[PDB]
Amino acid sequence: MIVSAIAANALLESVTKFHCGVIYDYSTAEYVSYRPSDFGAYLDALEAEVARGGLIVFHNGHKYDVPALTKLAKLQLNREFHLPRENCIDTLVLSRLIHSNLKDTDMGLLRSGKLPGKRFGSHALEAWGYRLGEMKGEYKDDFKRMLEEQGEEYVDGMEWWNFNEEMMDYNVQDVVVTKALLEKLLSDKHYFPPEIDFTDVGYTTFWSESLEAVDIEHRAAWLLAKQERNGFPFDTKAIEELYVELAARRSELLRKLTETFGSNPSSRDHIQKKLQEAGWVPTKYTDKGAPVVDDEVLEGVRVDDPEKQAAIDLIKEYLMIQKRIGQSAEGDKAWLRYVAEDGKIHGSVNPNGAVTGRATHAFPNLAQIPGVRSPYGEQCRAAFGAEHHLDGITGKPWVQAGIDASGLELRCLAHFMARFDNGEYAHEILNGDIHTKNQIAAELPTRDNAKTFIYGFLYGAGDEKIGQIVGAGKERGKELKKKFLENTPAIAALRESIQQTLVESSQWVAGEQQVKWKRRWIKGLDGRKVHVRSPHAALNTLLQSAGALICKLWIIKTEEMLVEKGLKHGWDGDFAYMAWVHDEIQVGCRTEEIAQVVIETAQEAMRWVGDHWNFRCLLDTEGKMGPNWAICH
């Protein structure tokens, strides 16, 4: 196993030249520096570690280093350089896995003054250097101040323009931090046993003799990096074709909403000063004094003035128009600013910045696009589809396949409660109408009330919120929950074993529950440490971890089987991963025939995961074929 980190001229989007790179080999216990005229030998040294059957350690390698050296080897040396996933390790990925929390631990490091506040909780290489005591300085700062003591000014992102011996020295500096952070991650005896040097071993022994979560996260991070490079095709004209229908409506409404109110329907310090003059008495306030002015209360605001009352719905539309504009046409997001020259949006994704499960998406958040049930969402969802590019060569309309996890949340509960009811509740899922059973069990009037109950009750809603479902308060809530526990004993006993797994005894002392903690981490499905939580609720943490870890393995096995079936991944191939959303995925497909294979494969892949972890409940998927996202869901 060798440890490295590289230095290029810019990001992966427009990287042109390779500057330097250092390779520390543990068998020789000595570093090796590479220069612009040594890029060829650098690629050979990495291939040699692959030929021996070892491993290559990069920081942010799955997302940057490895794909950039594939791109850089194509334009500079014109060679096919491709690192296999199995022979690659990303310290950044393990850091987010092993140190998913840090929130706690970083507090003392912050109190110590050993961590910059700008580098709080960051998994960046420099952020970890201060944590381990290996930061002698940063290349960006020893460059800025040294440009002063030389003359020339500074450009926001110019320290990577040209190769200099100080970068070569700080390139080594990034490797020794990568090395020390790697060893800091290998010293956690819950993911890596106390065997031997896990550097000394080959990749075949590495993945299997390590905790399973280690392997999944590197397969997930490798897979998601491909999806970002694939990107999600974007119809610029269509979204532009939305802005006037919103902006003209915004301008026309603003005119009408200034004739009703003389001398901005967008701020809370505005309407509070205005609406409290038309006779509206705020019922619910906020923890800072100001009254609540959300969608809920506005629907119920009643004023004697007919014009003011009718103007409320015009404010309701205004805020929503601003919302769509504020998501589709604003500044520094808006999708329209993120459209790359290939007509696609490359939305980034953090493998699992959320302790339990489900990645985080940003620049732009591809997971918060308005659904087809929300206003103007039909047009918005239509703007996302594989139909925006009809094949990279053949001109063949690419069709989209959208596959989601059928009621994954409730099925995860049946598996963990199958420990107390012997597959009873799991069979009620298969029999169908689990919301009908929960309705009978909790004695609710309508099935829809049971649907919003089972999720609310499971996820820690108070007795008022439960009572407010049927139009009541905490009175009906307590009896609605107590009745459900009696009719479904397994759920109640489930919340016992959990409450007695992380607590020894609890006690209230002047405002704080003083739990005598037995463990501050629930074991997941792969064996990982899953957050710490704090109070009585925890079941929500267990279920969302199960489903997302199911989906993570699901989307990996799906792509693995599709590749195993011969289907090439990419826009120049048969399919391309475009988006992963919670329990659903959107996959571009070159032909309808291929799209059918994707749907069937996703269902078949769902069985390996369900079989692997011996899930007591049946995992299933449903696929929808069509041009865009408004059709596939």
Partner: protein
């Protein structure tokens, strides 16, 4: 004809090992026909562990558990079960025994547990001859209709006395016990005891129990499908800490260390622990 009938209605008696997950991850539990072998160092939790499952199975997932405690009267086993159900060391307290009786709290717990009419036991103690248990063990399974039969301590053979070495009695008994299990389709959990090694520190102070150190030429390593083993150093910093080790699993074949557990001196339960040596 039988396979369609079996596979459609099959396990269906695959149960659910509680107290610690990981045992389920490597064994998926027991089948209707299999025989679970539970063992550990003398008095380290053999009786305690199996007693939790019988309770657990016979309460939450309404299964009919049959009990055959040959070293303790039926009254003592009920005492533990009653205390175990209500998370209390009902034995380990002269006050608690006196308590629940005078305020009428005994009948409360009693109806709560045995009310579903699930737990059934055998009274004998008088040596209990081999075909004076197997006949009755079948009577539960068949007459009372039990899904799981529990036989604590399998060194009390006592049958056809006059043949050198009871090394055959344990084998002959195990074969008849194993046979009975599948021909009726019952989950059979049996507890045995280990030989005293005297070749180093012995069991109660550490020492992993392999497959050879039990009886070596054992038949119980052959007839029994799954073998659960408990290890704990009661002379260490963690006497309550117990290691669970799968010694055999005909079903999965996945052996090794399952997980850990902690003996709650308050509830007498084996709550799952957090450990990785």
């Amino acid at each position: 004809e039988r396979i369609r009938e079996h596979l459609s209605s099959e396990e269906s008696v695959g149960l659910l090992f509680s107290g610690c997950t990981g045992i389920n991850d490597k064994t998926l539990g027991a089948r209707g026909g299999e025989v679970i072998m539970v063992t550990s160092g003398s008095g380290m939790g053999k009786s305690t562990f199996v007693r939790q499952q019988a309770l657990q199975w016979g309460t939450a997932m309404g299964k009919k558990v049959g009990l055959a405690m040959l070293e303790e009267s039926v009254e003592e086993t009920a005492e533990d079960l009653i205390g175990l159900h209500n998370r209390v060391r009902l034995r380990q307290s002269d006050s608690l025994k006196r308590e629940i009786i005078e305020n009428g709290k005994f009948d409360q717990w009693f109806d709560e547990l045995f009310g579903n009419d699930t737990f059934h036991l055998y009274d004998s103690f008088a040596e209990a001859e081999t075909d004076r248990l197997l006949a009755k063990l079948a009577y539960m399974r068949s007459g009372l209709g039990c899904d799981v039969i529990i036989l604590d301590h399998i060194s009390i053979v006592v049958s056809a006395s006059g043949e050198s070495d009871e090394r055959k009695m344990i084998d002959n008994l195990m074969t008849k016990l194993k046979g009975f299990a599948k021909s009726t389709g019952v989950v059979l959990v049996v507890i045995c005891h280990l030989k005293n090694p005297d070749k180093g520190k012995a069991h109660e102070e550490g020492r992993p129990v392999s497959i050879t150190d039990l009886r070596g030429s054992g038949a119980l390593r052959q007839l029994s499908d799954t073998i659960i083993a408990l290890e704990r150093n009661q002379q260490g910093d963690m006497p309550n800490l117990v290691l669970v080790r799968i010694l055999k699993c005909r079903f999965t074949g996945d052996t090794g260390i399952a997980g850990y557990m902690e003996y709650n001196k308050e509830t007498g339960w084996l709550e799952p622990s957090s450990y990785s040596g």
